[PDB]
Write an enzyme that holds these catalytic residues in place. Structure first.
Site, PDB file in Angstrom:
ATOM      1  N   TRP A  65      43.320  45.886  39.970  1.00  0.00           N
ATOM      2  CA  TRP A  65      43.561  45.567  41.201  1.00  0.00           C
ATOM      3  C   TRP A  65      42.518  44.749  41.868  1.00  0.00           C
ATOM      4  O   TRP A  65      41.427  44.744  41.533  1.00  0.00           O
ATOM      5  CB  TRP A  65      44.295  46.646  42.182  1.00  0.00           C
ATOM      6  N   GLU A  82      37.619  38.220  46.080  1.00  0.00           N
ATOM      7  CA  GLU A  82      38.444  37.199  44.940  1.00  0.00           C
ATOM      8  C   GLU A  82      39.306  36.422  45.687  1.00  0.00           C
ATOM      9  O   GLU A  82      39.276  35.073  45.260  1.00  0.00           O
ATOM     10  CB  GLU A  82      39.165  38.028  43.846  1.00  0.00           C
ATOM     11  N   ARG A  90      34.620  49.013  37.046  1.00  0.00           N
ATOM     12  CA  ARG A  90      34.475  49.670  35.781  1.00  0.00           C
ATOM     13  C   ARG A  90      34.332  50.998  35.936  1.00  0.00           C
ATOM     14  O   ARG A  90      34.139  52.009  35.235  1.00  0.00           O
ATOM     15  CB  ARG A  90      33.344  49.150  34.767  1.00  0.00           C
ATOM     16  N   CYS A 129      32.731  42.852  35.018  1.00  0.00           N
ATOM     17  CA  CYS A 129      33.482  43.560  35.982  1.00  0.00           C
ATOM     18  C   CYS A 129      32.892  44.812  36.836  1.00  0.00           C
ATOM     19  O   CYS A 129      31.945  45.457  36.398  1.00  0.00           O
ATOM     20  CB  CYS A 129      34.674  44.435  34.896  1.00  0.00           C
TER      21      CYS A 129
END
Ligand code: HEM
Ligand code: HEM
Ligand code: ILO
Ligand code: ILO
Ligand code: ZN
EC number: 1.14.13.39
Lengths: 414, 416
Positions: B292, B297, B123, B120
């Site tokens: 979000w 992506e 973070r 991620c």
């Protein structure tokens, strides 16, 4: 055992059984992965003042010689058995041995084939090998290098090549090329610590002026070479301009791009790595092929610690450099890469774009799966710096590991 | 120097040493012999269905470790409450073979798991997570209520808020609570006669599974799938999400008027729902979370992957690009405009989104904070660096150490 390797685009899978032949450890451990690291912390190439344990050098040798005879379908033959005894004989008596020109050619090609970080290995079998072991001076290295450059360059129709200078000798000094590449642009540190030229070459530039080189004052000044014979101070040699082919950079449609006065050389010739074959170490073995457009267009020109021309171009493109969401960086990077390709093609100099290059590397993986049961590859280095997932390699899992022969990093001679 | 991994940033020439990895109490797929860091699913963390109750001995040390982590976090290590909580866990395990977490402990563990997620890049937001406690849930029906409540709080009409809903932990000799869908919000993937897929090819399996369970399938390219919720020892039940709750964004380009005519769209809430949440040994098989989107992506992976919508060629053709030659960089040009479209459409629709540049910069800030607070940060380079313009973002030039820390989010076998 054998790792499963998947390609998330096609759904296909394969096992890697080649990593089994890996006789050298990497930086990874079950506790944590360090594959993202560029330089080894301990996988260096410690000094060679005392000979290498005949126990070790001998097993590597027998293995390489074994590799060589399997290659020519004469394993267990007579010549093979007798070649092994020669090596056994030489080592037992002198603590070292020597390769035959043919074994050397085979070895150089294998080292490239095994290079985990090289996306252009589909060409591994096409390599011109210049035997420069008959070299005793820094002036002789320069002639060899000039001949390599001429041949490799071939007036824009680039041909891959490697030149191998004398192997390392215990207790004796190494033949070394101080420059990291045969052709590099000087990096001049100025006033407020800023840099004119290639910031990546500040140090080698300083070492040169420190040996009598008259510096220029441009952004693209070709550096002279610092060649060094064993236990001697390096010598300075300037490359004959007509030998250093360069490409002026211009854009297909943006008439103003040529104005920037940007340019790059045609020959990517790494010269600070060490070639290891059957335990023998070649501290000076410069190799070269041809550029894949992103190396220049993305890395050399757009890296923040390199020429970092991203903002200049965006401004001339009249882009919104006020915010990140306008993707002005992504937009300008694409035009600079287009300009490298266009410029190289226009000048009739060999170059490969990242899409064609990675497509051809995918074929290489297939070829190797059949030929050896796997292919060591470093994903971070194989996937291009821009448009990563737009290429096939991104979606392909990879296994990284060290095989020999091999190209390895080695300490800086100074 | 320091006997820990030396980590370098090639852009800034700075060096750091990761000492936090020494805390890794579980191995990954790599060995000194070969690096398997690029494998998406390396059988390591794989929290395979272990029906028979865990070695009370193994669960204890994991439990003890977590509790210490918790008391550490509130600066009460070695305190009496700490020791008593320690004795307590051990008793409960001794007599029942398992144990339970206090409210505040669950919140702490959830955030830690996100904090510990190597893949991620967002973070830096780890401390701001809304933890919905749903450990009282006792039916597929109730699961659907919580989920709807999550989506409603998380969506927040475009002003997205990160959150996680925690359903009952796995129990000795009992069925797991499971959400069959990979995300609370997914588009259908219809297998065609000619062999092709309409919609999103990534969800073909889950699409055929809903149908096999009573869903009356549609035939669109962006049909929001129903949810298959499975309560302990029971067939999964089917549920359809109230359209008003599923916030979507039509895609238009800022200057290319034809792009909007393509009819492309995407939902605003990215909500992973198939991962296992592990805390102190206890296993939360159903604990969907959401945050979000980072524009790449959607714009790069979802819309341009070969095995996804694969719209690259279609857009390139509308841009009148030369798609017969690689050197025209037609793929690159189209990707950029598509990513721009996604960003522009969310900003227009006032729905939270962050571009790959902004995101990676904030992740660099997060790496610095963690270097000080914990002596490092587990990160997966291949996943942290954006699918487009890699070396143009700061993380590309930052070496990274990857390793598993717990609490953690792990992959788990599909329920079926
Ligand atoms: C035919 C054209 C070739 C192309 C297009 C090509 C392309 C590349 C690229 C893109 C990289 C990564 C560069 C970077 O990111 O710094 C690379 C690395 C490498 N290549 Fe190739 N290559 C070619 C020929 C060669 C040849 C002929 C050799 C050796 C005989 C070779 C040996 C290597 C090695 C050892 C590395 C790693 C260097 C390092 O660690 O810095 N390559 N190549
Ligand atoms: C707030 C904004 C957030 C952003 C922008 C963000 C962004 C990302 C991105 C870009 C990925 C990789 C996606 C992919 O390549 O498939 C990712 C993965 C991940 N994130 Fe975050 N994240 C956010 C919130 C969350 C939250 C709230 C949690 C959990 C509490 C979380 C847990 C994870 C995990 C476990 C993964 C890996 C999942 C996998 O293996 O597929 N993220 N995140
Ligand atoms: C042979 C080759 N294509 N590349 C080797 C590395 C060259 C370096 N990336 C550069 O940009 O000079
Ligand atoms: C929270 C978040 N931003 N991402 C989680 C993963 C979502 C997935 N990459 C997708 O594109 O749906
Ligand atoms: Zn690794």
């Amino acid at each position: 055992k054998f790792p499963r390797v998947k390609n998330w685009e096609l759904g296909s899978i394969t096992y890697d059984t080649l990593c089994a032949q890996s006789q050298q450890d990497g930086p990874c451990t079950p506790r944590r992965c360090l594959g993202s690291l560029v330089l080894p912390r301990k996988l260096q190439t410690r000094p060679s003042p005392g000979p290498p344990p005949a126990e070790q050098l001998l097993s590597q040798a027998r293995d390489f010689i074994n590799q060589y005879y399997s290659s020519i379908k004469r394993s267990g033959s007579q010549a093979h058995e007798e070649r092994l005894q020669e090596v056994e004989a030489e080592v037992a008596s002198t603590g070292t041995y020597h390769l035959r020109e043919s074994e050397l050619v085979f070895g150089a090609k294998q080292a490239w084939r095994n290079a985990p970080r090289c996306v252009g290995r589909i060409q591994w079998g096409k390599l011109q090998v210049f035997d420069a072991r008959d070299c005793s001076s820094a002036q002789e290295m320069f002639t060899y290098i000039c001949n390599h450059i001429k041949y490799a360059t071939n007036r824009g129709n680039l041909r891959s090549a490697i030149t191998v200078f004398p192997q390392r000798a215990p207790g004796r000094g190494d033949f070394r090329i101080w420059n990291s590449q045969l052709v590099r642009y000087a990096g001049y540190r100025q006033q407020d610590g800023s840099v004119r030229g290639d910031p990546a070459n500040v140090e080698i530039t300083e070492l040169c002026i420190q040996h009598g080189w008259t510096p220029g004052n441009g952004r693209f000044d070709v550096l002279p070479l610092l060649l060094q014979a064993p236990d001697e101070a390096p010598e300075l040699f300037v490359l004959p301009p007509e030998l250093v082919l360069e490409v002026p950079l211009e854009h297909p449609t943006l008439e103003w791009f040529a104005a920037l006065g940007l340019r790059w050389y045609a020959l990517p010739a790494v010269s600070n790595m060490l070639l290891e074959i059957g335990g023998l170490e070649f501290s000076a073995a410069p190799f070269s092929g041809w550029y894949m457009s992103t190396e220049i267009g993305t890395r050399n020109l757009c890296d923040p610690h390199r020429y970092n021309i991203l903002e200049d171009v965006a401004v001339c493109m009249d882009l919104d450099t006020r915010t990140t969401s306008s993707l002005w960086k992504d937009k300008a990077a694409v035009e600079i890469n287009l300009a490298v390709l266009h410029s190289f093609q226009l000048a009739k100099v060999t170059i490969v774009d990242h899409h064609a290059a990675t497509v051809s590397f995918m074929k290489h993986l297939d070829n190797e799966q059949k030929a050896r049961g796997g292919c060591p590859a470093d994903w971070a280095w194989i996937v291009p710096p821009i448009s990563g997932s737009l290429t096939p390699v991104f979606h392909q899992e990879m296994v990284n590991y060290i095989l020999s022969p091999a190209f390895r990093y080695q300490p800086d001679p100074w």
